[PDB]
Amino acid sequence: GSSGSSGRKPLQEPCTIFLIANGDLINPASRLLIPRKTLNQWDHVLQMVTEKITLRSGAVHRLYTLEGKLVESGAELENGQFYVAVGRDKFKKLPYGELLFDSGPSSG
């Protein structure tokens, strides 16, 4: 996307991705939108992802999909997908697909 010195920008539709606190299996996800202006700047993304998912360790430094993928930039992102906010720790591959669609609890 060679962004020259042109005013009106081309078709740049935003992306709505869901975030989830790493190591958290009690709270659901968080539908957050990322503008194309920020998508390019991965650093800018994490700065916003934290606002929705504030890790106890601090802020977010990297993202991880439910499959265990690593998104270092806005190239691995998708439209309407789920991701996890991983800080300065290891990816705790946990079941998130369940937190999405509520499910009757066992202990009761």
Short mmCIF file of all heavy atoms in Angstrom, two decimals, residues 15-18 78-83:
data_model
loop_
_atom_site.label_atom_id
_atom_site.label_comp_id
_atom_site.label_asym_id
_atom_site.label_seq_id
_atom_site.Cartn_x
_atom_site.Cartn_y
_atom_site.Cartn_z
N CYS A 15 -11.04 -3.40 10.27
CA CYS A 15 -11.16 -4.81 10.64
C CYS A 15 -11.59 -4.96 12.09
O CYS A 15 -10.98 -4.37 12.99
CB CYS A 15 -9.84 -5.53 10.40
SG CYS A 15 -9.62 -6.15 8.72
N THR A 16 -12.63 -5.74 12.32
CA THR A 16 -13.14 -5.97 13.67
C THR A 16 -12.66 -7.31 14.22
O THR A 16 -13.20 -8.36 13.86
CB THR A 16 -14.68 -5.93 13.71
OG1 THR A 16 -15.15 -4.78 12.99
CG2 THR A 16 -15.18 -5.88 15.14
N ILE A 17 -11.66 -7.26 15.09
CA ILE A 17 -11.12 -8.48 15.69
C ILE A 17 -11.42 -8.53 17.19
O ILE A 17 -11.56 -7.50 17.84
CB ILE A 17 -9.60 -8.58 15.48
CG1 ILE A 17 -8.88 -7.46 16.25
CG2 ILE A 17 -9.26 -8.50 14.00
CD1 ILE A 17 -7.41 -7.73 16.47
N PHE A 18 -11.52 -9.75 17.72
CA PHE A 18 -11.80 -9.94 19.14
C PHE A 18 -10.52 -10.24 19.91
O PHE A 18 -9.65 -10.97 19.43
CB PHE A 18 -12.81 -11.07 19.33
CG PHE A 18 -14.17 -10.77 18.76
CD1 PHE A 18 -14.40 -10.87 17.40
CD2 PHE A 18 -15.21 -10.39 19.59
CE1 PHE A 18 -15.65 -10.59 16.88
CE2 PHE A 18 -16.46 -10.11 19.08
CZ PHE A 18 -16.68 -10.21 17.72
N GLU A 78 -7.25 -10.79 10.76
CA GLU A 78 -8.37 -11.18 9.91
C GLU A 78 -9.62 -10.37 10.26
O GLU A 78 -9.63 -9.60 11.22
CB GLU A 78 -8.66 -12.67 10.07
CG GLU A 78 -9.24 -13.32 8.82
CD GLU A 78 -8.95 -14.80 8.75
OE1 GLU A 78 -7.80 -15.20 9.00
OE2 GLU A 78 -9.89 -15.57 8.44
N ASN A 79 -10.67 -10.55 9.46
CA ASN A 79 -11.92 -9.84 9.68
C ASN A 79 -12.93 -10.72 10.41
O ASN A 79 -13.50 -11.64 9.83
CB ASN A 79 -12.51 -9.37 8.34
CG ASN A 79 -13.80 -8.60 8.51
OD1 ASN A 79 -14.80 -8.88 7.84
ND2 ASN A 79 -13.79 -7.63 9.42
N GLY A 80 -13.14 -10.43 11.69
CA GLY A 80 -14.08 -11.20 12.48
C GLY A 80 -13.46 -12.46 13.05
O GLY A 80 -14.07 -13.53 13.02
N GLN A 81 -12.24 -12.34 13.56
CA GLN A 81 -11.54 -13.48 14.14
C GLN A 81 -11.22 -13.24 15.61
O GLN A 81 -11.31 -12.11 16.10
CB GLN A 81 -10.24 -13.75 13.37
CG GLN A 81 -10.42 -14.70 12.20
CD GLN A 81 -11.61 -14.35 11.33
OE1 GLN A 81 -11.71 -13.23 10.81
NE2 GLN A 81 -12.52 -15.30 11.16
N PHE A 82 -10.86 -14.31 16.31
CA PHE A 82 -10.53 -14.21 17.73
C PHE A 82 -9.03 -14.31 17.95
O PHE A 82 -8.34 -15.08 17.28
CB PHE A 82 -11.25 -15.32 18.52
CG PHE A 82 -12.70 -15.03 18.76
CD1 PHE A 82 -13.66 -15.39 17.82
CD2 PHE A 82 -13.12 -14.40 19.92
CE1 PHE A 82 -15.00 -15.13 18.04
CE2 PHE A 82 -14.45 -14.14 20.14
CZ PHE A 82 -15.40 -14.50 19.20
N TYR A 83 -8.52 -13.53 18.90
CA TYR A 83 -7.09 -13.53 19.21
C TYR A 83 -6.86 -13.37 20.71
O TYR A 83 -7.77 -13.01 21.46
CB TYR A 83 -6.39 -12.41 18.45
CG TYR A 83 -6.42 -12.58 16.95
CD1 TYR A 83 -7.55 -12.26 16.21
CD2 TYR A 83 -5.31 -13.08 16.27
CE1 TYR A 83 -7.58 -12.42 14.84
CE2 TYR A 83 -5.34 -13.24 14.89
CZ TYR A 83 -6.47 -12.91 14.19
OH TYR A 83 -6.50 -13.07 12.82
#
